[PDB]
Design a protein around this ligand. Sequence first.
Ligand code: NDP
Ligand code: NDP
Ligand code: MTX
Ligand code: MTX
Ligand code: OG4
Ligand code: OG4
Ligand code: UFP
Ligand code: UFP
Lengths: 505, 505
Amino acid sequence: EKNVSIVVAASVLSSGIGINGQLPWSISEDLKFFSKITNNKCDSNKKNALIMGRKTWDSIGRRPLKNRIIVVISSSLPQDEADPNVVVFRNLEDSIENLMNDDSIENIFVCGGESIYRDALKDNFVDRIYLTRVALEDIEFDTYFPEIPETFLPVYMSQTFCTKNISYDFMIFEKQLKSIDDTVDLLGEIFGIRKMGNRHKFPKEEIYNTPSIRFGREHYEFQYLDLLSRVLENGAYRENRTGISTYSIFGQMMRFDMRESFPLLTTKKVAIRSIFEELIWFIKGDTNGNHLIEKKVYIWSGNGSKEYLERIGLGHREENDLGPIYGFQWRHYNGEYKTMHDDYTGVGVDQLAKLIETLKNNPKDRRHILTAWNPSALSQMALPPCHVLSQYYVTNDNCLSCNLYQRSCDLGLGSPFNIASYAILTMMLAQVCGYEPGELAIFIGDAHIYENHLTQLKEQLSRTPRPFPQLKFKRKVENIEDFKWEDIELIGYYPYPTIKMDMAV
Amino acid sequence: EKNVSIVVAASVLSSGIGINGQLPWSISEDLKFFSKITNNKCDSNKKNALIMGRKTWDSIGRRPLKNRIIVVISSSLPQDEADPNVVVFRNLEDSIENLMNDDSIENIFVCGGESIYRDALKDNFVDRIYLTRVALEDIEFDTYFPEIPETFLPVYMSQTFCTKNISYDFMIFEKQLKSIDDTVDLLGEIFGIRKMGNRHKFPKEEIYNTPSIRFGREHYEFQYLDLLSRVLENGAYRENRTGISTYSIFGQMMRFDMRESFPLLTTKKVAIRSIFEELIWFIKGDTNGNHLIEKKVYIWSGNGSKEYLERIGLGHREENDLGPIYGFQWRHYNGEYKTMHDDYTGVGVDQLAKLIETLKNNPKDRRHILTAWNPSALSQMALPPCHVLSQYYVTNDNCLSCNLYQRSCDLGLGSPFNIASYAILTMMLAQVCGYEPGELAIFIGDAHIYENHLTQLKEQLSRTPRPFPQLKFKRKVENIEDFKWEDIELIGYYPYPTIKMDMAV
Ligand SMILES: NC(=O)C1=CN([C@@H]2O[C@H](COP(=O)(O)OP(=O)(O)OC[C@H]3O[C@@H](n4cnc5c(N)ncnc54)[C@H](OP(=O)(O)O)[C@@H]3O)[C@@H](O)[C@H]2O)C=CC1
Ligand SMILES: NC(=O)C1=CN([C@@H]2O[C@H](COP(=O)(O)OP(=O)(O)OC[C@H]3O[C@@H](n4cnc5c(N)ncnc54)[C@H](OP(=O)(O)O)[C@@H]3O)[C@@H](O)[C@H]2O)C=CC1
Ligand SMILES: CN(Cc1cnc2nc(N)nc(N)c2n1)c1ccc(C(=O)N[C@@H](CCC(=O)O)C(=O)O)cc1
Ligand SMILES: CN(Cc1cnc2nc(N)nc(N)c2n1)c1ccc(C(=O)N[C@@H](CCC(=O)O)C(=O)O)cc1
Ligand SMILES: Nc1nc2[nH]cc(Cc3ccc(C(=O)Nc4ccccc4CCC(=O)O)cc3)c2c(=O)[nH]1
Ligand SMILES: Nc1nc2[nH]cc(Cc3ccc(C(=O)Nc4ccccc4CCC(=O)O)cc3)c2c(=O)[nH]1
Ligand SMILES: O=c1[nH]c(=O)n([C@H]2C[C@H](O)[C@@H](COP(=O)(O)O)O2)cc1F
Ligand SMILES: O=c1[nH]c(=O)n([C@H]2C[C@H](O)[C@@H](COP(=O)(O)O)O2)cc1F
């Protein structure tokens, strides 16, 4: 009995491996992973064995590897007794005998082609699968990886990495103490909601995304998918200013990486264009809702209709004049807001401009804050600022991190937008100031789920995540308000089908 | 071979158990815990065995317990063969035979007096200890619990509970997968700081408080003591506006409970009086530094000296005229700040008053925000607001929770004060509005440690924590600015000796 694992790097969707006798990508870090994973020996005078087909043996140059015995599955190659680091077997079934004897071989790894992968799974010899998912699908394959059978379960999913603008993950598939559990549960019976642990229950398998991945939830999309589960388990049914009631908890956070990936949800086709047009709308200082409607973006029409505006006591306002919201408080703080058609160039504290000047001249400064809560002009807003405070931080490696506090997040409609919106905003500040994107942390107050999103959000938790895409700018801009949608390149985004959710006006 | 545990409820410091033949406290939940912990059987047709001395057998009334065999250790009591749920042995050594030959007994529990506790440890019969630490020391004992030998290590420590204004914990003392670890480490060698996991390394045992408690870090003081450990492991040496450099990370949070306890650090004698006088100073709208100096509180002298004020370009300011800091922005927002001795009654948005009126009339409201960042009047401040935004939330149980975002935390000098300040403020808002204290969450930006605190904070991590104290008000106040230091009763606070740290002016 010895561990027999599979090492493979396939595409994210079609699961393709190699084209015309060679690989369709050149990722250096992946090959280094193959080296480290196949040289993992626990004893000293022992070496691992790698199994591959002839066409794979040909593709690697017919040369042995460092302290690894190469096993070739060929019906034509002669068993050369000269080379001890390369052995040839006539078939895969006969080749699996270095487990009942040959103690020298510690572990066994299967890394051949489709012909060897398919026969290794159908014969039930595989105990573990090391999968490297590459985000490449607009190309052509000729050799694919067989679909993983239901007997294997995902146990680990790494963070999204990047190499030459190509995103890739690392997953593990396994074939599927007691003294504290019998005490915390007893204290949970004595104290009900007196014990704070009962107020934050661990979600059950029915709302936990990919529950087989227990200890290896490293993909930072789980920071969002586990928040949905945490709301369904502990969310309190509550009313609000709209007719749609919510399930809300208080005090949650999400952490994201922006160096090797771009935090854009893959479990739902997020409209990335609508997020950008809203962000550049904020950066320009514009509070005219029609400008977004004139760009085929209808996300501020509900909160800017004639019925809604007169309902909240703003009948004196034009159709889509939202008012001093983010975008007016960013560029003009404490400015006498008249209408949307007015000229505020020069009035108000330009927080965004001073923020850039502070990030360049004083990086070690701790007060790189951008606020949006102005109590003096709240009754004039069509809607109070949801994402309020935002703090930025420069590391010693010229990286730019971002922290956001959100008073209430509409998980399903507002959180996926706010994740990408401030991720793009951080990258824009990083380019203009000359830094690199770092980490993104979002601190949430009233994390709620509207009751008409339960059917859709329950579907999102059923979809296993995919690696994050890459976001690259097409040109360096002079100022900051010069970005255009054409200057944005989204690389390797293959999400799940979009699910429609209605906005609670 | 079967488990032989010890169940005991001793004092926090002297470890006292019982006085004049009875217990020195009446905690109903503790007895309920003793019942549930001794009725934990896995086999149905099997019963546990409880061992106690004669003087303890007398204290419980000489009556058996529900489906538990009581073993009495007495040299005078006759072995009554009539009662099958009570058996008498002449000594403790002879009484322990129901493990090698008696299958009927599943588990063994030792819960006698000092005579049985000391003999159970000195003879090395104990495999596990269930300790209930009660915060009572101003009384008199007569029977104590033996000091835990070095062979036992803490494995679990529950949250601080409360019963009749008495805090108590629950601890466990034990006698002192593998496939994913060998993959995340490999990815940590390939990618250096490219992998986000390496930027947030798990602290080492040498800076981890009570490293034996791995899975049972439920005491919410660990939310602060593990933040110190996380800074020492991953903190980047950085400069700032003062001569003292720091070790800072970005994006950390802490969680606290205010229902059954009061988040006041026990690893250091925190000056609670100075925290209150600062908090009530904010509520009144006062920005005069001398008023705290006239109350034997010298925490704003460094940032309010004649030398410091002229160094930051405010030489035209009086001695301790701090300016519009928190405390002016709370009660008077966007008010024309003149001097410290002015009458701003009527000018500026009274955020605190509107907050109280909103918490009463509209609890389900999501915009219970109290901000302190006013970019229009930042150059007038002697020091920008460190703790900026604060959001409040009413649960369905008429409880008041609080979320805070802090721009920079001086861990060791500023964090312990800010924890209690917003904890007391939440209780003040809860009483005036008619709610109960709930949860407290603090969201941190630049979590740093000044380099002159390393010797002291490394000492703070060496002392194992103690249960939180209780904070109760002595009277109900009419408004909110009527609180006085005499109206506060701190119950059960037994911290470690105070350690002096210098403020980076
Ligand atoms: N992304 C990845 O992880 C990997 C990708 N690849 C790619 O896949 C491609 C190659 O794979 P593939 O085309 O499927 O060819 P294979 O690598 O699977 O090799 C197949 C050959 O092995 C022999 N063989 C296979 N099955 C048997 C059997 N049951 N009994 C006896 N002999 C057998 C035959 O050779 P013979 O003629 O001697 O009988 C057969 O032609 C390449 O492009 C390569 O780059 C390869 C490895 C890994
Ligand atoms: N806080 C807690 O968890 C608990 C507290 N207590 C408190 O502790 C106090 C009582 O405990 P304590 O004073 O120590 O007395 P004990 O409960 O330990 O009982 C001692 C008696 O057991 C017999 N005994 C003790 N040692 C031996 C021995 N080595 N060999 C043979 N017989 C022995 C003797 O009985 P004999 O007269 O026959 O010689 C002795 O009088 C009470 O206040 C009680 O309430 C008790 C249990 C739990
Ligand atoms: C069989 N094969 C195809 C191939 C390519 N990429 C993969 N990637 C993964 N994740 N898994 C595989 N099984 C895999 N297989 C191989 C095997 C080894 C080398 C190789 O050159 N290995 C060097 C790697 C050199 C390096 O460190 O850069 C070694 O030292 O083992 C290339 C292709
Ligand atoms: C020997 N003794 C003293 C006593 C009191 N408190 C303790 N508390 C702790 N944590 N550990 C002990 N060993 C302990 N012992 C006892 C033992 C049982 C009961 C008792 O009444 N038990 C009932 C409990 C009734 C209830 O649910 O409140 C039971 O069903 O077990 C009281 C005192
Ligand atoms: N209650 C409440 N009030 C709010 N006011 C303003 C907002 C922001 C916002 C308003 C609307 C949306 C929205 O429809 N997203 C979306 C989601 C999935 C698929 C497609 C789309 C848009 C369609 C497209 O591609 O055009 C997103 C964000 C907001 C909110 O989210 N909730
Ligand atoms: N850099 C920086 N600047 C700041 N300006 C204003 C503050 C607030 C503050 C200033 C000082 C303290 C302080 O000495 N605490 C303390 C800690 C442990 C033991 C005893 C004490 C006081 C002794 C006693 O009062 O009994 C706390 C809080 C602040 C800060 O914390 N850091
Ligand atoms: O950027 C946004 N992010 C967001 O989460 N919302 C959602 C949060 C909440 O569901 C609603 C605001 O309702 P309320 O003002 O009562 O908090 O809008 C709206 C935005 F514009
Ligand atoms: O309530 C407070 N909390 C706090 O953490 N500081 C410390 C944090 C840091 O040491 C300093 C902030 O100065 P600056 O952020 O301008 O560097 O004050 C000060 C307070 F008054």
